[PDB]
Design a protein around this nucleic acid. Structure first.
Ligand SMILES: Nc1ncnc2c1ncn2[C@@H]1O[C@H](COP(=O)(O)OP(=O)(O)NP(=O)(O)O)[C@@H](O)[C@H]1O
Ligand SMILES: Nc1ncnc2c1ncn2[C@@H]1O[C@H](COP(=O)(O)OP(=O)(O)NP(=O)(O)O)[C@@H](O)[C@H]1O
Ligand SMILES: Nc1ncnc2c1ncn2[C@@H]1O[C@H](COP(=O)(O)OP(=O)(O)NP(=O)(O)O)[C@@H](O)[C@H]1O
Lengths: 317, 308, 232, 73
DNA sequence: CCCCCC
């Protein structure tokens, strides 16, 4: 019969020390222990006894086939660029962490606004019909640009709907108006990295309240850490923790987590270990005054560089 | 552990109360303390205490298995689970080994996730054995597994069956991962139906890194408890554990080494270090950075484009 | 029983407790395999034909590796002879320091039974250090109490049955001879010789045997191949 | 930043944090939840509640893009 | 007092 060590459970360090000093090495020896008996023997308080009993007695197994069906039903956030959609497997994937690395002024924030617009696209139009959460740390989230992108997306959906000749498309676009799009983008302004960490901690509760959010964007994860943080070890710890928080949020709440990152001197910033954080990595870079998107790391598509551009209509090929 | 009713036959409540009152709380205190003096100052029978100690050591201690019996049982119960990659199989001498922790060390985009996905696809389809993929960094995409299975075979029913064999579990901090591994240990205990044969944990370093750093050593303890869970899964439960680990440069020698430090460097029985070619994207150099049955440092070339 | 000089001639030019200390892939478990082979191979081949007990507190004992080493050590290798040689070998699996202590207290009752088991490999003693040092809290006495009890039981066992204890301690600290002691002082006092392992960039391995009662350092160089350990 | 005395922290826990030189939101959030488990006691479940508590006092307020549209006009 | 950390 298996034995689960208390060091494995998220018990209080002081409570774990007192429980093993009392002699509880494995949690199996506490399931039948009453909370009053536990507190009288170990010496921890009543609340601590109740909490540790809850924790020890607390401890989804979806097969890869069910995961594939989820991936098919949970549509990718279409990027409106055919090349990136092809090399991202249909767009920015849900339940994944994408990292848009690049030099300043290459089009990372334009992509973030485009995705925030494209999440509200209805399901019958290939979208996910969800809200977007924007976490802007660089102070570059321009509302006029996202309004223009929303207008262009609405026109594109109108064109494809009236090419389809379908009443369901018209009904689904009826609530897909500019006011709804701008009311479906929950924007946070994290002034510094402690604000960002606090907002990432509050994101699970916010999304439990807002159950229809499908995208979370961190417009600049390099900015709050490369500035006002002179400790490299602390930066590494905070980045690892925040990366785990973002991936956990994306998978638990069926999201896509975009993370914009700056370039350092060529190579993505925030250390080489941070390259292990995001599931997908897209470097946006300039070649002869023309924009190329490179799929540096992706667990589903081969590395390949494609052509894209920014137009008044938004994020095009 | 502590003394409780039903822990072992022959004990009673008043015995436990007397032992507690005589500064004996646990099994280690019961068996380390002198039986004669506790018997004479406690009122309990000496023979009863001797029998209690004997059954306690019979139950809580690990019997020494003979070398020949162990050898003949692992000559059948072990398995060289082929990775599905010819060159990586030749580097590992035909591939994984059931009963070991295998660590696929590498940098970002080094192929550890792809190696583990090909491993899971080949085990689920080639050997028709269930796989557990403990996704921690989001690397596992069922579309990539489907692509690998389509490369392996073009029968839709076979691909669907192989995908259903691969069981995906998401665990993003150390406590979720430990809960997942302990739940798997309980599941295998109940099962001993197609049981899980490969446990891919991609990546251990993703969930262990937040623990490390600062003035706390419970991060090291949680890392070592994760190591104990992985090694009990590997050896005691007889299934191939393939963890993936990041790679870091030591700030004293400028040499690449597995992450999570010296304490974790001893954890994987086998370790494959994947790195990129200094002079194609698909091609990667695979080194046997650590092994127990093969010379260290052998270089092979693995081309991810050849499968998929 | 057998002497320490014949256990492996190169390390021992001269009831001991010996420690193996070194990073991963430096040959500690392989030196343990070499000692196991020299102790369990028959007198005809050139071994001592004495039983060896191996404690996996770390779960890296590769049975296939030991069988390969044996098959290469014999002049003529056969399945029956390999099974006979492995009948002398014994393995214990310890998952925790409390489990290690209970296994030791039960192992006393088999040491009494087996007179020919002269050598006791314990790989690795430090495997439960970190865990032991967190649930014991900040009190140094509490955190190393169980490993102290294991150390006392180990010294009792090696004194009663005249065992040669080859312990492996994993180097996990840097010390700001790469050796920073971290186990309990009740274990350090037992150690007679400390043998530090290193690898030269990778077939060549360096061992440094320091005798504590004389604080004398001796240097050895050895290689590992399919045969086992061959001392240069 | 904002000191934990006015965040809503309990006085005993404020003293425990101050004993380890923990005073502001930066000092609290910058540590891993396992370090906070060590310093504050409490569980991982019990320290995520506290991390959410401190963040709610020093996290940005939600601002819908329609809110920015209304404010700019 | 070492722990991890490109
Ligand atoms: N309305 C527009 N029409 C055409 N081009 C535009 C428009 N708005 C922006 N651009 C171009 O698109 C790019 C904007 O990139 P941008 O998305 O701001 O990168 P960024 O991530 O914000 N840089 P940084 O803030 O340092 O991370 C520039 O090349 C602009 O010239
Ligand atoms: N279908 C495919 N065909 C060819 N190459 C592929 C394919 N999918 C992925 N790749 C390659 O795999 C690389 C990324 O490998 P991957 O295994 O996801 O990185 P990883 O290091 O294992 N995961 P991480 O922990 O984030 O570093 C890409 O850059 C591609 O070169
Ligand atoms: N057949 C072989 N031929 C050549 N070299 C080998 C062979 N088998 C193992 N080795 C190498 O010899 C060394 C033996 O490893 P090992 O003895 O387990 O190191 P270690 O000190 O035990 N590390 P650890 O297991 O974490 O305690 C490693 O460097 C192996 O790569």
């Amino acid at each position: 019969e298996m034995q689960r060590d208390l060091v494995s459970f998220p018990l209080s360090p002081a409570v774990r020390v007192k429980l093993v000093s009392a002699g509880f090495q494995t949690a199996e020896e506490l399931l039948e222990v009453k909370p009053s008996e536990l507190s009288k023997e170990v010496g921890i308080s009543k609340a601590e006894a109740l909490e540790t009993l809850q924790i020890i007695r607390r401890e989804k197994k979806c097969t890869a086939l069910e995961l594939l069906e989820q991936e098919h039903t949970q549509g990718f956030i279409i990027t409106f660029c055919s090349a990136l959609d092809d090399i991202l497997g249909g767009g920015v994937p849900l339940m994944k962490t994408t990292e848009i690395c690049g030099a300043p002024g290459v089009g990372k924030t334009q992509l973030c606004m485009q995705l925030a617009v494209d999440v509200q696209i209805p399901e019958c139009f290939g979208g996910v019909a969800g809200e977007a959460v924007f976490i802007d740390t660089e102070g570059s989230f321009m509302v006029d640009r996202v309004v223009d992108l929303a207008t262009a997306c609405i026109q594109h959906l109108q064109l494809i709907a009236e090419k389809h000749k379908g009443e369901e498309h018209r009904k689904a676009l009826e609530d897909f108006t500019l006011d709804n799009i701008l009311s479906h983008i929950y924007y946070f302004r994290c002034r510094d990295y402690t604000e960002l960490l606090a907002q990432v901690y509050l994101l699970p509760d916010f999304l439990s309240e807002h159950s229809k959010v499908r995208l979370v964007i961190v417009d600049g994860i390099a900015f709050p850490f490369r500035h006002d943080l002179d400790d490299l070890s602390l930066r590494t710890r905070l980045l690892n923790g925040l990366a785990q928080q973002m991936i956990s949020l994306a998978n638990n709440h069926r999201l896509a987590v975009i993370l914009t990152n700056q370039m350092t001197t060529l190579v993505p910033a925030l250390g080489e270990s941070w390259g292990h954080a995001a599931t997908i990595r897209l470097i946006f870079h300039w070649d002869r005054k023309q924009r190329l998107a490179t799929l540096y790391k992706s667990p589903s598509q081969k590395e390949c560089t494609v052509l894209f551009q920014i137009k008044p209509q938004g994020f095009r090929d | 552990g502590v003394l409780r009713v039903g822990l072992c036959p022959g004990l009673t409540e008043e015995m436990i109360q007397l032992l507690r009152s005589h500064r004996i709380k646990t099994v280690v205190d019961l068996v380390s303390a002198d039986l004669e003096e506790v018997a004479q100052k406690c009122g309990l029978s000496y023979k009863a205490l001797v029998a209690l100690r004997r059954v306690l050591l019979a139950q809580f201690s690990a019997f020494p298995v003979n070398g020949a019996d162990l050898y003949e049982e692992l000559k059948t119960s072990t398995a060289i689970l082929s990775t599905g990659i010819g060159s990586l199989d030749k580097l590992l001498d035909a591939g994984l080994y059931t009963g070991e922790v295998t660590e696929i060390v590498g940098g970002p985009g080094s192929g550890k996730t792809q190696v583990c996905l090909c491993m899971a696809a080949n085990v689920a389809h080639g050997l028709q054995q269930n796989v557990l993929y403990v996704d921690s960094n989001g690397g596992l995409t069922a579309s990539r597994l489907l692509q690998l299975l389509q490369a392996k075979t073009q029968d839709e029913e076979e691909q669907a069956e192989a995908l259903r064999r691969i069981q995906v579990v998401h665990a993003f901090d150390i406590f979720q991962m430990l809960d997942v591994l302990q739940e798997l240990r309980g599941t295998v205990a109940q099962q001993v139906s197609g049981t899980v044969k490969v446990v891919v944990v991609d990546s251990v370093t993703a969930v262990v890194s937040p623990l490390l750093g600062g003035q706390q050593r419970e991060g090291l303890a949680l890392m070592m408890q994760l190591a104990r869970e992985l090694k009990t899964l590997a050896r005691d439960l007889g299934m191939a554990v393939v963890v993936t680990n990041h790679i870091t440069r030591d700030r004293d020698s400028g040499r690449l080494k597995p992450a999570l430090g010296r304490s974790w460097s001893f954890v994987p029985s086998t370790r494959i270090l994947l790195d990129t070619i200094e002079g194609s994207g698909g091609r990667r150099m695979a080194c046997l950075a650590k092994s127990s049955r093969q010379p260290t440092g052998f270089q092979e070339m693995v081309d991810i484009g050849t499968w998929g | 029983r057998s002497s320490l000089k014949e256990i492996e001639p190169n390390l021992f030019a001269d009831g001991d407790i010996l420690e193996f200390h070194g990073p991963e892939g430096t040959g500690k478990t392989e030196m343990l395999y070499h000692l196991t082979a020299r102790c369990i191979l028959p007198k005809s081949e050139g071994g001592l034909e004495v039983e060896v007990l191996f404690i996996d507190t770390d779960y890296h004992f590769d049975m296939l590796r030991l069988v390969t080493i044996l098959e290469h050590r014999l002049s003529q290798s056969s399945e029956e002879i390999i099974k006979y040689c492995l009948g002398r070998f014994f393995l214990v699996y310890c998952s925790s320091s409390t489990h290690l202590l209970l296994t030791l207290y039960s192992l006393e009752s088999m040491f009494c039974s087996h007179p020919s088991l002269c050598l006791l490999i314990l790989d690795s003693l430090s495997a439960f250090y970190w865990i032991d040092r967190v649930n014991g809290g900040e009190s140094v006495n509490l955190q190393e109490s169980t490993l102290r009890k294991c150390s006392q039981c180990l010294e009792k066992l090696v004194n009663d049955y005249r065992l040669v204890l080859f312990a492996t301690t994993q180097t996990i600290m840097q010390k700001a001879i790469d050796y920073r002691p971290y186990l309990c002082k009740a274990w350090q006092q037992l150690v007679k010789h400390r043998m530090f392992f290193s690898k030269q960039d990778s077939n060549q391995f360096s061992l440094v045997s320091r005798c504590l009662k004389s604080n004398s350092l001796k240097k050895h160089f050895f290689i590992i191949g399919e045969s086992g350990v061959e001392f240069c | 930043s904002k000191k934990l005395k006015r965040v809503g922290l309990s006085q005993e826990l404020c003293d425990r944090l101050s004993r380890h030189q923990i005073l502001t939101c930066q000092d609290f959030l910058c540590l891993s939840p396992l370090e906070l488990m060590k310093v504050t006691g409490l569980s991982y479940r019990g320290v995520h509640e506290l991390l959410c508590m401190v963040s709610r006092a020093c996290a940005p307020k939600m601002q819908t893009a329609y809110g920015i549209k209304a404010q700019r006009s």
